[PDB]
Amino acid sequence: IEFYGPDRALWLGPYSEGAVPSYLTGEFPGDYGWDSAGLSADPETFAANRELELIHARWAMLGVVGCLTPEALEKYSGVEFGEATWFKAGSQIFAEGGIDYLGNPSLVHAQSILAIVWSQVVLMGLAEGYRVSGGPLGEATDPLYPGEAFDPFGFADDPETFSELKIKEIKNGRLAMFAMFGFFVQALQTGKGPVECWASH
Amino acid sequence: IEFYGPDRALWLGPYSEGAVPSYLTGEFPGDYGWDSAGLSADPETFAANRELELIHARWAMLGVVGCLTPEALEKYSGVEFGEATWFKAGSQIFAEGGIDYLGNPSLVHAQSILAIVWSQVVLMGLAEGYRVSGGPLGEATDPLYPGEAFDPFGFADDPETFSELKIKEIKNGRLAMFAMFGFFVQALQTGKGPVECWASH
């Protein structure tokens, strides 16, 4: 169907005639007309919120995949991890033997949390500074879509395909954020991993 | 006294000369000049906040009445409920015998939480969709005051009486929201119902 312009899909379905704010016109990906708290009435605040949403969504997709993969590997493939549960995997650094990637001592075999934290601080600070402005992989032509070195396979060369892929990215990312919130609440309530919860249901 | 225009009541009393933002001019009900975080400086955000406040206030009035009525009935009138305390009344669905209205098995006698949740989802979704736009009880001429089928006794026919009733509604609703927050904090801290807390004090 349509995901742009005035004939797009809306968040309340057939009951969304009086639910769409005026400043939401279908210009940007993911516009379902859902701003009922008026948090994006300011155009600059709207742009900041769009960037925040896309960054949160990409992090959430990565987090869903990385929270599911080791638990599923332990359950089925037989790979042994110190703590394969996503909300317990941070405590392996304090257990004796450290964090062994895929359970193999010959791999990373990290033993100090301080070195991990400092390396992450330096590397992530540099990477985020590059994302905001400049960087050796190209400059920040777009805050969200700098597809020169970050689009090396050329999926975004066609503008219509680019718009469709933007819609797909925002939808998958919103689903991943919803799934991550579900993971957080399930971990808080039941104390079981998502794979184990799925198996027991 | 006066609750509209430039000579209205203000939230700091005689010390509110420098406390009223410029965009608050006494045009809408409940305007005491209290916006110190600047959350309603944008007119569209102000309208959204007004709608949110009125909806929260009506829900809070209903919640105060519904949280007080069963406990008071159990304490004095002698009516027997499974769990008459407001923050324990949700767990009656898991107790054997289910939820009996007024404690009578011949009444609702619900035992499945899933059916209750699904019926509530369908009915409340339809009702909220009607409230936002359209609906078989008239269309949404006003987001907050669609008084054609929802004002059948004609209390809002006189504009001056309508303004006074709007002021009364917003004030009672703010008081009910304050009372509901008090209920939440008292339940969290002491673990006793509002009626029992009142009796013991």
Next chain:
Amino acid sequence: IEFYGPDRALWLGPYSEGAVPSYLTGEFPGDYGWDSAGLSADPETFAANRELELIHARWAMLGVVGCLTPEALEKYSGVEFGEATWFKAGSQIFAEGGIDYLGNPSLVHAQSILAIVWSQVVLMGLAEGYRVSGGPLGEATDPLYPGEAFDPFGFADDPETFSELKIKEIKNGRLAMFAMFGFFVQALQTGKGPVECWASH
């Protein structure tokens, strides 16, 4: 260095070219170009946020000093307090003997929490009303800098020195807010006072 105008210090250092919003131009103290959520895009909301930040910062500086002083006095100077830890000092009013200033019964020797609360309500309400508008120590020339009776030593007479002192005040206040957040998190996690935590590390 420079803390005003377009050649000022910025929050991302050499990577802050694309990190500074347009509405942040170096006109106000503490402008490092850090508004990534777009919460201050509206100028009136920006002014409200500036007032909130400065008030929070002054309260945080006072809180750091007042949370460190009694614990350090007990540890080193030998002064005896009922509860010298900052997050336990509120419970001395319920212990027998009350709250003795510097541990001396001849001092305040308060016994009732209700009188303390009522006196604080009256005095702080009057003082905050004076701060917002009017007051017997001068009227509110500036929401944040009413330096007539509140600047009696005349440190703010020179405009350039006034700007430098504003920068120093906002920086020390932000550091104190960061320290107070650290105090809160350390108290929540370890249950030990900042002085004791410093000694054991």
